[PDB]
Curated annotation (Swiss-Prot), chains A, B:
Protein and nucleotide deglycase that catalyzes the deglycation of the Maillard adducts formed between amino groups of proteins or nucleotides and reactive carbonyl groups of glyoxals. Thus, functions as a protein deglycase that repairs methylglyoxal- and glyoxal-glycated proteins, and releases repaired proteins and lactate or glycolate, respectively. Deglycates cysteine, arginine and lysine residues in proteins, and thus reactivates these proteins by reversing glycation by glyoxals. Its main location: cytoplasm. One of its GO terms (biological process) is RNA repair. The active site is at residue 181. Induction: By heat shock. Changing residue 182 to A: Shows approximately 17% remaining glyoxalase activity compared with that of the wild-type. PANTHER family: PROTEIN/NUCLEIC ACID DEGLYCASE DJ-1-RELATED, PROTEIN_NUCLEIC ACID DEGLYCASE 1. It is found in: Cytoplasm. GO terms for cellular component: cytoplasm; cytosol. Optimum pH is between 6 and 8 for glyoxalase activity. Significant inhibition of glyoxalase activity below pH 5. Optimum pH is 8 for aminopeptidase activity. According to some authors, HchA exhibits an exceedingly weak proteolytic activity against bovine serum albumin (BSA) and some peptidase activity against small single amino acids conjugated to a fluorogenic reporter. Another report showed that HchA does not display any significant proteolytic activity but displays a physiologically relevant aminopeptidase activity. This is Protein/nucleic acid deglycase 1.
Length: 279, 279
């Protein structure tokens, strides 16, 4: 298999991951398992998903990485949560359609694919995050904010006033915040203000791993900044230095380290959320 | 050549124009000519370009047309205007990078390609239109607003409060408004208010032509609405029913009918703008 970045001809100077890197980091079938919720939540609260509206991430040599949200990271936790009785709605900063890394889609997965087909409209036709925020109050029917990973989470979210406002709402109102991989870079949106996530501990994708990708062609160049180091400056603790599929719970902040953590995170989120609403 | 829509694998259920339609509607070299401005403008006023931030246009069967701004329509008028002494700056509604129809890029054009390479950063790193608007006043160093065509102009622009505000500024302050092909759909942003473009006459891409494309595979499905009919309801006059490369001037509203009109529009814009600033 080739280690050369694969041209994405839709865009100028843009590349998908190399054939070789895809063979290491994607599969046609996910690890979804353990969706066993005999007494689901029956209320109306939903997961608010903050997703990526831009597919193209600039790298350090000017080439664009053709990325987006990671479909395993976003669909597996949502599958468990939906099974536990929590439907979801999607928002992007612009209001433009969610942009997925389709090259990581588990295309042969007999459970995840039907789930995607059923719900793809929600991703393709999201709300504008600012509109959701304008309406938020103590009674809002959102049980959690979910920020899926994929390198698309690095675009816009870390700088977004709307994301900051949403996260402040969730914490003030004792709701869940769920994220994994590069998703927690969205927490950087809080850098300008009083920072309600100061002191919190998380799993996240290690910055060190992002420096080993470009050589095998998973990205066409290096990242121009590293979210982990920045989150540490923002007073957050990253508990892992490796990729093991680890998940962590700190109060109502539930996180995972990588795509490998996606199934475990769905389980932890479902368990925690059911308990909180029960009842 | 095949008339089958060509899959754009970056996105789910999305298609580029068919091989056959590309052979009819694109060329490796543009018709750029007549750039002869012996006494250019020397001031600081620029063209403000309102461009497309979304590549994917939903068609009536659920397939996405992989479109964007048309590079001939956007680069040819800008080439003439730059030669006449008017530099440009780019804004999108979201602030995300301009999305071009790269499949229409005149890749062998020895004049246009170097111009694109020189200025591609301006398209890739645009301002957010709302930020530009917040700052607008009587002394703003914008000589014109340019809305290039391509089917990407149909996305967001026709519904945009920021676009409405920009156009109201231009008209109130007796600046130029330049557009061609589907670009004038952006004028639909004025539908909610007092409509300062009521009564104005334009060239535009004929709605009838958009109903003949999908059969030859230029788009993967039909449009769900037609901008010409809507602009007529909004009190504007469309003077052409065909595609001939026609351009029109009504006061300071300068328009063209199609990519064929792009060179002529650059010339008309340059001539009109030089005269207005002279001096
Ligand atoms: Mg190498
Ligand atoms: Mg047919």
């Amino acid at each position: 298999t080739s280690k050369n970045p694969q041209v994405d001809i839709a865009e100028d100077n843009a590349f998908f991951p190399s054939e070789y890197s895809l063979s290491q980091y994607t599969s046609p079938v996910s690890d979804l398992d353990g969706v066993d919720y005999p007494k689901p939540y029956r209320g109306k609260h939903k997961i608010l998903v903050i997703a990526a509206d831009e597919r193209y991430l600039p790298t350090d040599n000017g080439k664009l990485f053709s990325t987006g949200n990671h479909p395993i990271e976003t669909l597996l936790p949502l599958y468990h949560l939906h099974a536990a009785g929590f439907e979801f709605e999607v928002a992007t900063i612009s209001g433009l359609m969610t942009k997925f890394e389709y090259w990581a889609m588990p295309h042969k997965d007999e459970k995840v694919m039907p789930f995607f087909e059923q719900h793809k409209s929600l991703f393709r036709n999201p709300k504008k995050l600012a509109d959701v925020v304008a309406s938020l109050n103590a009674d809002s029917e959102y049980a959690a904010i979910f920020v899926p990973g994929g390198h698309g989470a690095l675009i816009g979210l870390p700088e977004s006033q709307d994301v900051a406002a949403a996260l402040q709402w969730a914490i003030k109102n004792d709701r869940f915040v769920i994220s994994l991989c590069h998703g927690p870079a969205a927490f950087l949106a809080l850098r300008h203000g009083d920072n309600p996530l100061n002191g919190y501990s998380i799993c996240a994708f290690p910055d060190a791993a992002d420096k080993q990708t470009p050589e095998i062609g998973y990205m066409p160049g290096h990242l121009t900044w590293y979210f982990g180091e920045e989150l540490k400056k923002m007073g957050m603790n990253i508990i892992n230095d490796d990729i093991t599929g680890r998940v962590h719970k700190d109060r109502k902040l539930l996180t995972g380290d990588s795509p490998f953590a996606a199934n475990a995170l769905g389980k932890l989120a479902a368990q925690e959320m059911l308990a909180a609403y029960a009842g």
